Every structure is written in structure tokens, then in C-alpha cells.
Amino acid sequence: RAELCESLLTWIQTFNVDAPCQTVEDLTNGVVMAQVLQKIDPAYFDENWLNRIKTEVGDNWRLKISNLKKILKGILDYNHEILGQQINDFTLPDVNLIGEHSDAAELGRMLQLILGCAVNCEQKQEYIQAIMMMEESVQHVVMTAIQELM
């Protein structure tokens, strides 16, 4: 779903990575997702690892796809090589559609995989706490709205 992708984007924003990440388009060349995977496990997804991900991409969608396949393979490899408890990867994102068409539905599937890494890695209690703090944060917005109406 495209709506799931929008929601998972707000989760991506909790990482505060360097590259901009406000829209679906900001995620299509793979740089943001690579930087998030580095936050999740910087020992595995390290600076050397990130080197394979081209930054100067522009509108070269073939290059975007290339980047995205490296990230997807990276996620699968992390799951196989490092993680004891495997993630839910029965259905994989079609990253060709992300790169060529900025397909939000496919991008959402990829973000789900990355969230799967976050909540199954060694630091999972940190990431689960950060997700529940998204709930606390929204209630502050709602309480502000209520107070501006009273």
C-alpha cells in the first residue's frame, strides 16, 4: 500500500539520517535506506559497506536500481549472516519499480524489511522504544490542538 509507505516514511524520519527524507522520491536512490541500515547496525553496514552505494545518482534510474539491489541483498545477507531470529521476507520489494517508477507500494515493502531488521537486531529494545515514542509524540500534537480549541 502507498499509505503504509507514507507511514513508514515517518518512522524513517525518526532516525535523523543526513540525506533528506521528506518524500517517497527522497528514498528512491537508496542512500537514505543505506544510512538507516547503518544506524541499525553500524558494525555490519559500515562506512566500507556504504561505499558500494553511489550517491551522485540524479535521474539515472538504472543506477537507482543498482543501489537498491545492493541494499536488498544487504538486508537478506544481514538476516542470513548475522540475525538469529530471521525477519519476514516472504514477499520481497520489486526494487526495479522503486527505481524506475518511484513505486510507493514497493518502497513500503522495503521499509517493512528494514523495520524488521530494526526490531530483530541486538538493539531492538531501543528501536521498539523509539516506535512507542512516536505514539507519545502524536498525543502531544493532539493535546496541543485540543488546547488551541478550548
From Swiss-Prot:
Domain of life of the native organism: Eukaryota
Chain spans, region Sufficient for interaction with microtubules: 1-150
Entry's localization field: Cytoplasm, Cytoskeleton; Golgi apparatus
Calponin-homology (CH) domain sequence ranges: 2-118
Protein family per UniProt: Belongs to the hook family.
Subunit structure of this chain's protein: Self-associates. Component of the FTS/Hook/FHIP complex (FHF complex), composed of AKTIP/FTS, FHIP1B, and one or more members of the Hook family of proteins HOOK1, HOOK2, and HOOK3. May interact directly with AKTIP/FTS, HOOK1 and HOOK2. Associates with several subunits of the homotypic vesicular sorting complex (the HOPS complex) including VPS16 and VPS41; these interactions may be indirect. Interacts with MSR1, and this association is stimulated by ligand binding to MSR1. Interacts with microtubules. (Microbial infection) Interacts with Salmonella typhimurium spiC.
Protein purpose: Acts as an adapter protein linking the dynein motor complex to various cargos and converts dynein from a non-processive to a highly processive motor in the presence of dynactin. Facilitates the interaction between dynein and dynactin and activates dynein processivity (the ability to move along a microtubule for a long distance without falling off the track). Predominantly recruits 2 dyneins, which increases both the force and speed of the microtubule motor. Component of the FTS/Hook/FHIP complex (FHF complex). (Microbial infection) May serve as a target for the spiC protein from Salmonella typhimurium, which inactivates it, leading to a strong alteration in cellular trafficking.
Protein name stated in the entry: Protein Hook homolog 3
Species this protein is from: Homo sapiens (Human)
Biological classification of the source: Eukaryota, Metazoa, Chordata, Craniata, Vertebrata
Gene: HOOK3
Residues of the full protein shown: 9 to 158 of 718
